[PDB]
Amino acid sequence: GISRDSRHKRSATGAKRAQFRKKRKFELGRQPANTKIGAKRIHSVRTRGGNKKYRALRIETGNFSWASEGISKKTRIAGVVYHPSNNELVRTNTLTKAAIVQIDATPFRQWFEAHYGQTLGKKSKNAERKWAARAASAKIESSVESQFSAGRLYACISSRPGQSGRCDGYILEGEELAFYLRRLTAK
Amino acid sequence: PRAPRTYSKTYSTPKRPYESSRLDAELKLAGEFGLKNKKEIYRISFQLSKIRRAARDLLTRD
Amino acid sequence: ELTVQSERAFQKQPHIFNNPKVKTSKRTKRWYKNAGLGFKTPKTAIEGSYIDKKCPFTGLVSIRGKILTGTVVSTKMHRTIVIRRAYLHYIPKYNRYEKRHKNVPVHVSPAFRVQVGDIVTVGQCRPISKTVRFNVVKVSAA
Amino acid sequence: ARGPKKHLKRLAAPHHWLLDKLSGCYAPRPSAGPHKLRESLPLIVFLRNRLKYALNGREVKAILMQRHVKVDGKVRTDTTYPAGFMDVITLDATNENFRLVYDVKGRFAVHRITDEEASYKLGKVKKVQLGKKGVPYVVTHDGRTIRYPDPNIKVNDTVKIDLASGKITDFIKFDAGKLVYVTGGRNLGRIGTIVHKERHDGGFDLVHIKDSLDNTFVTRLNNVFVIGEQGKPYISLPKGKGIKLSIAEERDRRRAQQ
RNA sequence: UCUUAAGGUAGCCAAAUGCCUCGUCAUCUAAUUAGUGACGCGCAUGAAUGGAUUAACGAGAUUCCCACUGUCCCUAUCUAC
RNA sequence: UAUCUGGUUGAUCCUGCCAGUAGUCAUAUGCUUGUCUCAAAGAUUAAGCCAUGCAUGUCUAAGUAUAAGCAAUUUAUACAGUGAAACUGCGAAUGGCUCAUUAAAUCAGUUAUCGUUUAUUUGAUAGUUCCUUUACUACAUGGUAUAACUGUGGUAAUUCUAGAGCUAAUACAUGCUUAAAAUCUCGACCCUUUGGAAGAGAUGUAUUUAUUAGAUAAAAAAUCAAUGUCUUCGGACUCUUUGAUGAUUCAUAAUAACUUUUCGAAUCGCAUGGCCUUGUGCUGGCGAUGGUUCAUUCAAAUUUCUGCCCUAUCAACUUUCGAUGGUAGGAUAGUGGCCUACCAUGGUUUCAACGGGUAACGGGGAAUAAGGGUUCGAUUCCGGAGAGGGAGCCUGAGAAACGGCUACC
RNA sequence: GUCGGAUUUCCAACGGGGCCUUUCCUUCUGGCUAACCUUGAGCUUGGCGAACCAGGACUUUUACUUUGAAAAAAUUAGAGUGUUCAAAGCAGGCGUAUUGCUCGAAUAUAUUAGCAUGGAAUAAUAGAAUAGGAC
RNA sequence: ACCCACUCGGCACCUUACGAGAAAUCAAAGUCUUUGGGUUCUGGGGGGAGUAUGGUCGCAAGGCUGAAACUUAAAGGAAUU
RNA sequence: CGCCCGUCGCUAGUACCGAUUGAAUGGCUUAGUGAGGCCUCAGGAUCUGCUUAGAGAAGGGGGCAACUCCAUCUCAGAGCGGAGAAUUUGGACAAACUUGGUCAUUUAGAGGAACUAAAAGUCGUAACAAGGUUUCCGUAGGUGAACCUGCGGAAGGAUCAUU
RNA sequence: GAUCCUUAAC
């Protein structure tokens, strides 16, 4: 039943405004999703002019995309590891935009193995020609190799689970990934 | 709801109420033109003053 | 200023990610737009490392409506400053004027180096903050 | 106010309708239609005060139901259908071909057109765009849209519709030296013959127009309506041809033909 | 004017000073010989036999209130000696 | 319609007020009071409370009928005319009343949404609903309860009603119902490198992620790891573009994934010309509806600029612990301290901030008639607001609704 | 001067519009070619492009004043009107009076302020001074 | 140090009225109905009343700010005999 | 033989102060309580769409007498189930009641002290003339009362005047 | 140097 009008707030100088209107419909807000992990459940809430809103709550499996490939796969998420506004959100494992999370991303692991086949650690002519065409690009760098070998990928959720019920996201690649890993290890 | 119906007054009374010269002039005019009350002379004076105001606001320009 | 990433979050222009896979000249890419109406983006804003998601040139805001101008009166609060619009209110009873003024708070991008006693021009835009509704588009001082 | 206003009273209706204050404490509210609430003419006042073809609102609604009055070739069984500028009304009985065109006094007055002009129509293209499936289309002043337009046509041009299909019969480009019709304001009901214009980026471009009497005034872009080239208009004009006669002449005209 | 010289001025008061007297009025209470504020022909107030007031202080005297309670309704039980 | 006179003195000239004078979309009261138009009329005090009666319901040829209601087939054999009732649909958020709160609030003018809905209306917009994809599909088309009526029931009592019997689904879950051009992944080999093909699936928008495109201004040569189009192969390369305003991460198409699937007659009234291998076959128009929507009106929210009465016996105010700004997030139809977390200390003010008063709703307006001005404007129009006081909410596109509910007083 | 009416092969002041005596009155790309060097016999093949229009910009400031949309409709002055004058309110009039025809319902303040627009007189700000000053 | 003249700046004096004013009078109290050089302060009939209250300064006396209820037709200025 | 001042006498009216740790109403506000609607972790009355064996074994087959699938006149037995009224953890909007006060008003109050206005009151004459001590101002003291006196000031003085 | 006062205005 919260409100979103400015008529309840103090003036820029500090003048206390009087009560001129009762709370109105267009200035309503409603309680946050605080979506969690486990046993997906989606609630549909009817808003101004129909416009059904899907409130994520305990959503488990989302969709996540690679940056350089434009390639997205559905995958489960292990749970949030950082959130830029709060640490209590990190602790209670809620999903919000611009939060970095760990994902198993074995869909991406098998995807890379089936696409290029360069193993970590330590046959058909069509596939040989395909690899010859798309070769000389699997020596990008070492951080992505280490992340893939560990098997827990750092992906930032960028959608709003409290509107569309989708913890859709993009993996961290390059500058943002370096920033967040430095942040988590900075102690 | 309804549109108001516009009315207006037709006579403006003289500011000085009792002076011999004006009182006798209006009385003689009414009596010799066969009028019963001063409403006629007041209303025609109001109209004549309206016309003279129009003429003044007209001739004040080139 | 010294550090761009002092924030907890990663400040980046939305929907702009630069592919490191290739190695091309000027590997960093930055996005900007012409606010129009004759104002030109500073050549220092051309290569600057700031983000200012509300900037009229690099951010996502757009300028439309009223173009105002005034002298900055205080510059102690971040990415935004307030100016004095000193005008004369006419009093038809006494046929004379009187000096009134309004402090309109507006937004300054890090591209411009503003100060008190400097003259700036601002443009009406989408509500940026509780009070801010303008961004500076040009500085007339030197 | 908890929802749209559905009524409309006298003293609030637009001036170009000219309703007497008495004989009704409400003013026919135009419905949702093809043209704005103000700069449009509902059929009820046209048929009760502008024509006297039906002397009462019940009668007008009856004749509007029983399919004797059709607008734009379509019957439009709406008791207060808002008929817009340069719209065509075809009354099959008695062959009454009306054009809803602004007179020189700034009102909608009866205008007689023949079969050809009651058949065809003009329109100001309001915005060129491309919609679903990448189809180019344009939206005109009546809100009517047409798809697949010639890419030559741009904003603030004229398009001619044959009334058999939404396809554009002919196009009129907006450029220097073109006869224009201005609808709105104090210039309402005038022919302008645009000559030169200025941009003034930011909004509200104004254009200088000098008519066939070499009288030159200025009006905004949304107010004018380019109707044809020099000389022959692409629609017939009601008496006057949009000239704004000097106020000093109609008294002589009335004293002659009075 | 008389008596012994002057005749109680500022103040203050049923005051630790008032007989009558549990004075009269107001307030506090359900109810008040109590308290406080007023009144004052004050048995018998009163100006360094100091008058009036006064913040702070007080194991000084008095009234009301909040808190608290076996003071009481109305007693009961327990420990040591 | 630029007007003054009486009163201070024994008399005078003055200041000065008192009084007189005239008018009120300013009331009231008294004396009085026949009509032609003519109309204000519980406004001040009491936005106090109400006995009683009414003010929102509604349908066509065309959403659903069997009441055992009315009437008749010389034209339908299953009604097809009204149709009381009841279920669905759209309202009832319009209108009207009052002026309580309200002093940068509202409001007037001016701006903007490049920051935000689309049934209502208008024009147009799905041969991609073959979705374990060639015997799982019936496409001249599959299902589940139920309101009148039937009853032995109710009280000072409700616009109260439950279990029994079948009825209609546009009440609600389902999916096939009318081809591709072209592209990517699957998937036999010439034994080899100028390269694949039989056949399979995928390509509409409705939500989201990530990547693209969406800049032709005058200008010349050479290896590139691999010629990009097709061949005279000293490469001609032309047609490389899809577009406006001040420009956009605009519109818009494209790439890999998205849907727990949001979608595209499983409807009603009106004709029946012709093709025949004479079949409950082959065809075909006029009217409402949701659909992806695109865009136009009816709008609503937020909104830039300026402007509001009397007060200093209100001078400093603003941070419950958001006050100013920033980052990130959530919520909203949307931007935004609208709300949360973190950071710095800011923001307004003698050009009157903050506070108090308002017998203060604002404007278009009314009254003066020299000019200038003064006072009011609840109220016939517009913009707000409220339905006894705040608070909350369902439904609905649109109510914090009161002739709608949920509580307290 | 022409079958109660008025045009001018000049003497008055000029709202005004141009160029000149130091008055420098502001881009490069462009146009059917501009005041056109084209002249074939006095529709005829070659001056400096923004007098109108597209991209690079130099719009440094005001106040003021003159314009042009805008403060909605009644309400204001008012055009017109045998609502008998009328206040009002928009009518109504002309006939072939059995069929028909037609003028009408405009203009100013548009209560402050923003928007483009000619001027720049009246009061400031601004320039180049131990020259990082302009070409 | 005096005398004569000139000048600047002063404290001031005589006459008319150029003017002003109700007059007394005034070289300013003039250049103000032929009304505008700049600017500050104060007043709006006589009382109640410089009172009450709230502030504020003072040791106090008091100072500064400063009402209203109510009452009244005059109170006042300058001159005439 | 004019006017005129103040104190004390009588009547009325007006406001002011005032014990009552006064009262009421209205904000706004620290710490508390808190209906109800709302989102939510839980909760499960109550409604069936699909398949199965253990059945007396009908009625129909190969002998016609035992040896055998079929829908079934049934029930503690397996899931995918999907709708779900009660109730209930956490959380927000948050109506109504206390304890303190910014503060805004309205109002009761024993008494006190003023002011104003009432035909001929008393006591004295303070000012108006040099008003009989010129008057006035500020300040301080005194005093039945006007008022008197000290100090400084003013002329609005009773002097525009002593080369 | 006592010469203090004058039933109430018109």
Side-chain angles (χ1 to χ4, degrees), chain A residues 100-115:
Chain A
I100 90 166
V101 314
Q102 307 235 52
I103 290 166
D104 306 8
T106 68
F108 289 152
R109 269 287 333 273
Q110 81 97 62
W111 187 92
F112 203 70
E113 295 305 326
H115 185 194

Side-chain angles (χ1 to χ4, degrees), chain D:
Chain D
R2 300 167 42 208
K5 289 199 180 263
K6 292 277 135 190
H7 275 203
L8 204 139
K9 44 189 53 186
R10 296 263 182 75
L11 302 178
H15 38 256
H16 57 38
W17 296 350
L18 315 148
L19 300 305
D20 157 75
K21 301 144 55 205
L22 285 328
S23 75
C25 41
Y26 273 78
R29 177 159 194 116
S31 57
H35 294 82
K36 275 58 165 194
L37 214 287
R38 277 313 146 90
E39 47 262 46
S40 167
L41 180 276
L43 291 213
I44 177 54
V45 315
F46 188 30
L47 273 295
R48 167 198 37 237
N49 188 264
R50 249 73 181 81
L51 298 169
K52 316 151 322 173
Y53 277 2
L55 55 156
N56 155 270
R58 257 163 180 115
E59 195 166 356
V60 185
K61 109 182 158 200
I63 188 186
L64 179 138
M65 150 40 62
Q66 58 215 14
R67 221 100 168 196
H68 295 70
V69 34
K70 95 177 162 225
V71 174
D72 190 40
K74 330 194 175 299
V75 155
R76 307 289 201 201
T77 316
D78 320 271
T79 166
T80 36
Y81 179 76
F85 178 52
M86 263 163 148
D87 268 323
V88 285
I89 314 200
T90 320
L91 306 200
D92 44 9
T94 68
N95 216 347
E96 299 287 340
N97 308 10
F98 287 95
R99 169 60 67 113
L100 297 145
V101 60
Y102 267 116
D103 67 341
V104 81
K105 211 53 93 167
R107 325 191 312 246
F108 268 145
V110 299
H111 172 208
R112 206 89 47 181
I113 34 167
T114 184
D115 160 50
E116 218 292 277
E117 278 76 339
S119 79
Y120 80 79
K121 191 199 196 262
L122 292 158
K124 204 63 154 203
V125 46
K126 283 304 304 326
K127 143 174 54 165
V128 319
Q129 268 202 321
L130 45 55
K132 327 167 220 84
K133 270 97 80 197
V135 54
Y137 65 126
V138 314
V139 46
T140 55
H141 73 286
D142 42 345
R144 97 164 48 210
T145 202
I146 77 91
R147 263 129 180 261
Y148 308 115
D150 187 46
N152 197 1
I153 285 79
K154 279 287 153 183
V155 289
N156 302 123
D157 304 344
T158 308
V159 278
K160 174 182 237 260
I161 62 201
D162 198 271
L163 286 281
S165 73
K167 265 312 261 181
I168 302 312
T169 319
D170 198 359
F171 92 106
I172 288 52
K173 150 73 37 163
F174 192 96
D175 45 347
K178 209 65 148 129
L179 183 42
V180 202
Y181 202 157
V182 32
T183 92
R186 298 194 81 79
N187 324 106
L188 189 106
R190 295 299 316 288
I191 60 106
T193 324
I194 52 137
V195 38
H196 51 241
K197 85 98 147 193
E198 88 294 319
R199 304 312 226 102
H200 293 343
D201 44 345
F204 275 3
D205 306 37
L206 315 80
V207 295
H208 316 64
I209 61 199
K210 54 220 195 104
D211 58 6
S212 305
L213 299 125
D214 216 3
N215 302 329
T216 321
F217 40 104
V218 173
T219 320
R220 291 140 148 165
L221 59 90
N222 82 327
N223 259 286
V224 290
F225 192 151
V226 38
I227 54 100
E229 54 100 23
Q230 308 293 137
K232 187 246 182 183
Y234 292 157
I235 191 71
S236 68
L237 258 285
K239 181 169 151 261
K241 330 294 92 153
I243 46 56
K244 200 172 209 30
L245 160 65
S246 76
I247 335 104
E249 206 273 23
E250 58 288 29
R251 44 145 173 96
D252 323 270
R253 257 313 316 171
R254 292 180 316 244
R255 208 160 287 123
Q257 208 264 322
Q258 190 250 344

